[PDB]
Short mmCIF file of C-alpha atoms in Angstrom, two decimals:
data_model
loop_
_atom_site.label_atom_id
_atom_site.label_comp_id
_atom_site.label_asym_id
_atom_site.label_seq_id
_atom_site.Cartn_x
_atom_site.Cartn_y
_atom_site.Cartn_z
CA UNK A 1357 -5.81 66.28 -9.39
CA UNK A 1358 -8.57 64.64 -7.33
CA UNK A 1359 -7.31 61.51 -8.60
CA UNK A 1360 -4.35 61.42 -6.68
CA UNK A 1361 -4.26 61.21 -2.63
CA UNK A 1362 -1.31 63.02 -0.93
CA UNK A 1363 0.51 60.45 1.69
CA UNK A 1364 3.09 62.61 2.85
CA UNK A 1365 5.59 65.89 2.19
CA UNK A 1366 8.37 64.31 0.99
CA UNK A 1367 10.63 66.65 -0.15
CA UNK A 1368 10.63 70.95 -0.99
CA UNK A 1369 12.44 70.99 -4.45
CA UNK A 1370 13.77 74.17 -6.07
CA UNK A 1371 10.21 74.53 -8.03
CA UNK A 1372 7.24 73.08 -5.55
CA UNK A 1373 6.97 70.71 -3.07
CA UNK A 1374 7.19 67.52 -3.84
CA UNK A 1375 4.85 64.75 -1.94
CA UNK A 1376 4.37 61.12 -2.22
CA UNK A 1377 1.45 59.86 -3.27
CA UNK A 1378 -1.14 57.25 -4.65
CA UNK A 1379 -3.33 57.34 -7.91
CA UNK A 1380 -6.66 56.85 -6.77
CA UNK A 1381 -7.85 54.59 -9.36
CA UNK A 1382 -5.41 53.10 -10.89
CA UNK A 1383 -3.43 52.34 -7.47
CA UNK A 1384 0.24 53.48 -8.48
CA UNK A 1385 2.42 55.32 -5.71
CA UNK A 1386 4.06 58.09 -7.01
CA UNK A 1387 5.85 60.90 -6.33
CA UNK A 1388 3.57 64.34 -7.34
CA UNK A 1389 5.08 67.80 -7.53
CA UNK A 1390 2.94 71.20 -7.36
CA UNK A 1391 4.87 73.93 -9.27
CA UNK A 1392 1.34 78.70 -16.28
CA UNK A 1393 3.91 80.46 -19.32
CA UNK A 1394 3.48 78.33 -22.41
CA UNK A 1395 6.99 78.27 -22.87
CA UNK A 1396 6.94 76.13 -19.48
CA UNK A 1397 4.40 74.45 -20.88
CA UNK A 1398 6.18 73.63 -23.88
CA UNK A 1399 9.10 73.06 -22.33
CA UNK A 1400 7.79 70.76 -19.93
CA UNK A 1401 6.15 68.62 -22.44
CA UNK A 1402 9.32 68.01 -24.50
CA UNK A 1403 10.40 66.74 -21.23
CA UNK A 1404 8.34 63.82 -20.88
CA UNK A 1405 9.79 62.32 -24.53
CA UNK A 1406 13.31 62.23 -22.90
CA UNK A 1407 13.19 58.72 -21.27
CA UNK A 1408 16.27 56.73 -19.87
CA UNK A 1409 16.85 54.55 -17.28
CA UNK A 1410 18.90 57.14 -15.28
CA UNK A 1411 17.09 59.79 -15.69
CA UNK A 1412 13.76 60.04 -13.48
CA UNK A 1413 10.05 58.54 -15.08
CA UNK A 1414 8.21 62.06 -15.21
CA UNK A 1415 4.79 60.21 -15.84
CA UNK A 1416 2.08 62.66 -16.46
CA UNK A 1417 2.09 66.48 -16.62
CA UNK A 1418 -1.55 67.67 -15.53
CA UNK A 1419 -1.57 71.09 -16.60
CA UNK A 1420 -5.20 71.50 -14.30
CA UNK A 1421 -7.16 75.05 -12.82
CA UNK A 1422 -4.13 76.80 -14.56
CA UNK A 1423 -1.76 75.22 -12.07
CA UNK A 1424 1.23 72.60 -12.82
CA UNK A 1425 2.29 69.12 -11.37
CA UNK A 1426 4.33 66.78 -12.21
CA UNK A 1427 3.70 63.12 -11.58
CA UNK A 1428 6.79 61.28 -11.71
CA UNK A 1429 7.84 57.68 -10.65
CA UNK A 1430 8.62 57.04 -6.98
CA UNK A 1431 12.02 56.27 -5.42
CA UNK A 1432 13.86 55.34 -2.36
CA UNK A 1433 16.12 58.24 -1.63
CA UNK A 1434 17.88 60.87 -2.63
CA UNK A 1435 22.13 60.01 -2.83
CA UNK A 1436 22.65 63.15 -0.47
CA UNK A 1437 21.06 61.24 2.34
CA UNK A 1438 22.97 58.24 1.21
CA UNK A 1439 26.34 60.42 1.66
CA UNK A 1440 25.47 61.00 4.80
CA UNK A 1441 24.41 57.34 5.98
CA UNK A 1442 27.38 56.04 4.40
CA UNK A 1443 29.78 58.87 6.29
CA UNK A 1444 31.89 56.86 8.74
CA UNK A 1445 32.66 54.16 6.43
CA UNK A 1446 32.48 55.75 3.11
CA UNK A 1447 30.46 54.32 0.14
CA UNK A 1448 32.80 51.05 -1.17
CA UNK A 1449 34.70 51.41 -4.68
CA UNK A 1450 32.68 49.76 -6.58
CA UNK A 1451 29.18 51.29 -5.81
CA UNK A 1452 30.78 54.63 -6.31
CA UNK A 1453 32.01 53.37 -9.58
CA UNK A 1454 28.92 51.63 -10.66
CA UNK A 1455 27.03 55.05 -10.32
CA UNK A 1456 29.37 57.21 -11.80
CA UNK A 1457 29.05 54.78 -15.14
CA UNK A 1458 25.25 55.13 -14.76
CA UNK A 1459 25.16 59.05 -14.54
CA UNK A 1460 27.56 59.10 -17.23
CA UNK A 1461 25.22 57.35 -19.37
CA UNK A 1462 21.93 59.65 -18.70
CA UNK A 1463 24.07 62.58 -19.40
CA UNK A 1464 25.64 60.96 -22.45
CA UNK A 1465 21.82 60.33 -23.46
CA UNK A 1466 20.51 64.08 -22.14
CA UNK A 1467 24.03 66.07 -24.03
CA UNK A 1468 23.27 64.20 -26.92
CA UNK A 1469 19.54 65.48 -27.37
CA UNK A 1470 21.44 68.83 -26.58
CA UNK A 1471 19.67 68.85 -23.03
CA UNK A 1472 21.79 70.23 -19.87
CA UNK A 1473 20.94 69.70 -16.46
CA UNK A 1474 22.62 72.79 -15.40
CA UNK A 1475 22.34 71.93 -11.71
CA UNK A 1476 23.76 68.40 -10.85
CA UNK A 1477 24.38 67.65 -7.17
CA UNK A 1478 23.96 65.17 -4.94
CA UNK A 1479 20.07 66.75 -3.59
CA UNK A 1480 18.81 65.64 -7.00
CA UNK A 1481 19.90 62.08 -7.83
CA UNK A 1482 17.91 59.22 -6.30
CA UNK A 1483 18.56 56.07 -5.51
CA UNK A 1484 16.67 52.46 -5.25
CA UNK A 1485 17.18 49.18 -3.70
CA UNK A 1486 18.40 47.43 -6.36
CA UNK A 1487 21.45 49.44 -7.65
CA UNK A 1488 20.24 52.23 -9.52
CA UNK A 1489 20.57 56.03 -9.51
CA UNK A 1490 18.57 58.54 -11.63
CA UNK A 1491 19.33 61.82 -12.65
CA UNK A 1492 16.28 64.38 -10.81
CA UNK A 1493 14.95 67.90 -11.16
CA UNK A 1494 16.76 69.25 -13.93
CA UNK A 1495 14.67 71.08 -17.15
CA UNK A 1496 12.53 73.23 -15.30
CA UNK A 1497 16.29 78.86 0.17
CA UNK A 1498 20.05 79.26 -0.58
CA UNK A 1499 21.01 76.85 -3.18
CA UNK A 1500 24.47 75.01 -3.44
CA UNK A 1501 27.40 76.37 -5.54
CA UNK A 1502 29.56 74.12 -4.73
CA UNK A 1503 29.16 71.80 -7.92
CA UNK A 1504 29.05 75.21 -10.23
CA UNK A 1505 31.27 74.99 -13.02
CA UNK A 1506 33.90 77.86 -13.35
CA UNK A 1507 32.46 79.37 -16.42
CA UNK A 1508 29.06 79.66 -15.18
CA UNK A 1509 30.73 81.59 -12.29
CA UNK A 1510 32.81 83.81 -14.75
CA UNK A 1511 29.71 84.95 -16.01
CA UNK A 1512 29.36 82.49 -19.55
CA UNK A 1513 26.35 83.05 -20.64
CA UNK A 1514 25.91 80.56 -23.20
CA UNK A 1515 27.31 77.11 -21.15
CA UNK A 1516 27.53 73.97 -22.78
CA UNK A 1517 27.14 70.24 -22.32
CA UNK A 1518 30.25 70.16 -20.26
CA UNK A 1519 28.84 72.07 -17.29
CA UNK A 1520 27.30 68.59 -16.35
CA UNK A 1521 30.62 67.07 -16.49
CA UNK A 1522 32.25 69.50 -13.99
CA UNK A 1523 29.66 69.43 -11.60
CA UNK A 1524 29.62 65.54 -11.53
CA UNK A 1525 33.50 65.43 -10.85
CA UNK A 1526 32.40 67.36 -7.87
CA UNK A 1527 30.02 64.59 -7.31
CA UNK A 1528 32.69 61.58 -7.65
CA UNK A 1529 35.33 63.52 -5.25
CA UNK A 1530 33.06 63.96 -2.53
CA UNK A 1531 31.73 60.40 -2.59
CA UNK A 1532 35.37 59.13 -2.24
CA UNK A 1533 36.85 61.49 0.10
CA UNK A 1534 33.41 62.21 1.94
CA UNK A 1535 34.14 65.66 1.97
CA UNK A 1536 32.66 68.36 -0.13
CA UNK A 1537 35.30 69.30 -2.65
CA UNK A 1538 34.82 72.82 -3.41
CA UNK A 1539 32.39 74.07 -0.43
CA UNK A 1540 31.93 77.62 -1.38
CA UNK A 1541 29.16 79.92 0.17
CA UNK A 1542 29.58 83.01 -2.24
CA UNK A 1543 30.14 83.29 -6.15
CA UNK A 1544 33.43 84.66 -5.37
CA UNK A 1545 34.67 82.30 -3.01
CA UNK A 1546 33.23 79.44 -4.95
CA UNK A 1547 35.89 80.21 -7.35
CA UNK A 1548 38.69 80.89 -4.88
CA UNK A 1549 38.73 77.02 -3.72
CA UNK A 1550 38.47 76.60 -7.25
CA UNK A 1551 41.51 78.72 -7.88
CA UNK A 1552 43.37 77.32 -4.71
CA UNK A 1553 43.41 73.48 -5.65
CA UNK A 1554 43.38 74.01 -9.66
CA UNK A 1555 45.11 76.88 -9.67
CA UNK A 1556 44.67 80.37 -11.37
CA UNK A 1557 43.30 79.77 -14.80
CA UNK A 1558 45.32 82.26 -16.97
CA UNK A 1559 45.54 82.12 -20.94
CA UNK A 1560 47.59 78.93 -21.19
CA UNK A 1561 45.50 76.57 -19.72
CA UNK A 1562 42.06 78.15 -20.81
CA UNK A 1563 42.48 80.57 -24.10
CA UNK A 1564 39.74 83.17 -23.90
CA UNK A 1565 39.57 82.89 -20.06
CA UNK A 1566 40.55 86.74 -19.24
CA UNK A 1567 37.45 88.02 -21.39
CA UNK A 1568 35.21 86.35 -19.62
CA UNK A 1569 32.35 89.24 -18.01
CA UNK A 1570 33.43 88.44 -14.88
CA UNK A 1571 37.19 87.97 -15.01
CA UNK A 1572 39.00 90.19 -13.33
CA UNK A 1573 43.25 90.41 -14.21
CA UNK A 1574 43.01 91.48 -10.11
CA UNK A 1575 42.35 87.88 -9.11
CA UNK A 1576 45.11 85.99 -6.57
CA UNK A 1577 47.09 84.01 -8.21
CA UNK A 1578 47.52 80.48 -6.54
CA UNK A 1579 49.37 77.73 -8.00
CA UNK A 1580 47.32 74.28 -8.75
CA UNK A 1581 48.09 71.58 -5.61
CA UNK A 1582 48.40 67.78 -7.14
CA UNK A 1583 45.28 65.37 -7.25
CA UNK A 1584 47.58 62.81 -5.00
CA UNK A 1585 46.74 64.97 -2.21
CA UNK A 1586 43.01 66.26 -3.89
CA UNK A 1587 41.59 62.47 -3.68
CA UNK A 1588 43.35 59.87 -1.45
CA UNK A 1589 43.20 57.50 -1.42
CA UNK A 1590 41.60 57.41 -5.34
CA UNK A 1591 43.88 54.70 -7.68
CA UNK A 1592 45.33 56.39 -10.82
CA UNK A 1593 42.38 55.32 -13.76
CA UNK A 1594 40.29 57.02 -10.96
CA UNK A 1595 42.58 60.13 -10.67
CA UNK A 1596 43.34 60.55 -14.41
CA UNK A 1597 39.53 60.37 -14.88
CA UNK A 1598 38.65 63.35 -12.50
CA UNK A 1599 41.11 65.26 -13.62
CA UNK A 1600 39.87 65.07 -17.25
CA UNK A 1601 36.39 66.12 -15.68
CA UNK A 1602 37.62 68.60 -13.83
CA UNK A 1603 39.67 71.18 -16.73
CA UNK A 1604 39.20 74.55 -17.22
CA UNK A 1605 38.37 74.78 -20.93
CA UNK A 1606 35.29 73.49 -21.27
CA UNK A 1607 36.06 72.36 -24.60
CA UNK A 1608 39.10 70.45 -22.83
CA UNK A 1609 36.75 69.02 -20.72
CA UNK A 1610 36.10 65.07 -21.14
CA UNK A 1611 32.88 64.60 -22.54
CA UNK A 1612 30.41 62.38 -20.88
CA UNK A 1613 30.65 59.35 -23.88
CA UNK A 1614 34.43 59.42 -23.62
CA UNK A 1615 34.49 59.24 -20.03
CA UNK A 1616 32.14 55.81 -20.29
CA UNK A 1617 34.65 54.48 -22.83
CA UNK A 1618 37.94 55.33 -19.66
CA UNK A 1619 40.09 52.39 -18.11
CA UNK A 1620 38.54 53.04 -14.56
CA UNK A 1621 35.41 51.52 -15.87
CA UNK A 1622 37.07 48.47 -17.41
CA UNK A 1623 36.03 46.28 -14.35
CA UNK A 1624 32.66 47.90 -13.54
CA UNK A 1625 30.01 46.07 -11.99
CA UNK A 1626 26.65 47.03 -10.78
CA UNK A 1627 26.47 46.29 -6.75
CA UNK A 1628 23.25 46.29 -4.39
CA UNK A 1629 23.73 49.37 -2.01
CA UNK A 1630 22.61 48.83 1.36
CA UNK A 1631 19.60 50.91 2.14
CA UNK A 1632 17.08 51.28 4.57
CA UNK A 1633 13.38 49.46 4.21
#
């Protein structure tokens, strides 16, 4: 730890704050978190084997003065910021589609080591200058709902794979629209907006649904609006893709490899966003 030099705060993640830095030695900038329980430890460790190109470098893991930090590769920014930059305009097609394919490919890679990231949103992917985007904090202030998946909020306690896949259809709306799709700011109404645009989940389209711990029979019951007038001015591959991401029963849900192999991504490409520097 007094091998690396701190340059500057860049970022307060759900764990530590995160800084930018430089490896005194050895010269590399990186990007150092300050977060021990063995199972973190553990945990942690099994971390750094799980390498992809969309999914963050975590470098080192200096486990010093029984403290924790995380030394991980450095970026350019996170896609949040990006959202915003891009606003007025709106992000073109084919960047949105290029980084869809690549986030569907680190989850394909993470779901089928049977990792989750349990907490996708646009705060934790970054970007770089060449075209890339890289899954961030996931394995380890009021924190966003708004890309929660619907059995997570019905109280599931054991969640699978396709948690990822709800909260990145979140993702894709938002980036085409550039509005948030579901903005809730409470568990409850969270799944309102949910229940306003999908519509009520009952029996039919999600068997098992009213035994969930926090179902209640009680709930409104709004009928599901059409995705013509959900994502405008989305084409049809695009449509028919988020709605696949976006069903109730999670074991309806498109998985993250089938969604690669979908007709929207038939002409994918991989564009240069344009960034700051």
């Amino acid at each position: 730890m007094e091998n690396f030099q701190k340059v500057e705060k860049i970022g307060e993640g759900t764990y530590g704050v995160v800084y930018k830095a430089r490896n005194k030695l050895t010269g590399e900038v990186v990007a150092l978190k300050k977060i021990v329980p063995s199972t973190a430890i553990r945990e942690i460790s099994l971390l750094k084997e799980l390498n992809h190109p969309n999914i963050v470098k975590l470098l080192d893991v200096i486990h010093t003065e029984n403290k924790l930090y995380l030394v991980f590769e450095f970026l350019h920014q996170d896609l949040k910021k990006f959202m915003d930059a891009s606003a007025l305009t709106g992000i073109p097609l084919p960047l949105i589609k290029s980084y869809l394919f690549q986030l569907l490919q680190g989850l394909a890679f993470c779901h089928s080591h049977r990792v989750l990231h349990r907490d996708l949103k646009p705060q934790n992917l970054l970007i770089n200058t060449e075209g890339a985007i890289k899954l961030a904090d996931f394995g380890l202030e009021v924190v966003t709902l708004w890309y929660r998946a619907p059995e997570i909020l019905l109280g599931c306690k054991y969640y699978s794979t396709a948690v990822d896949i709800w909260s990145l259809g979140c993702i894709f709306a938002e980036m085409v629209t550039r509005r948030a799709l579901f903005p809730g700011d409470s568990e409850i109404d969270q799944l309102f907006r949910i229940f306003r645009t999908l519509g009520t989940p009952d029996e039919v389209v999600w068997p098992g649904v009213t035994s969930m711990p926090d179902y209640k029979p009680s709930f409104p019951k709004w009928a599901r609006q059409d995705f013509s007038k959900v994502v405008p001015p989305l084409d049809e591959d695009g449509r028919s893709l988020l709605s696949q991401m976006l069903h109730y029963d999670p074991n309806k849900r498109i998985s993250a490899k089938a969604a690669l192999a979908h007709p929207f991504f038939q002409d994918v490409t991989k564009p240069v966003p344009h960034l700051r520097l």
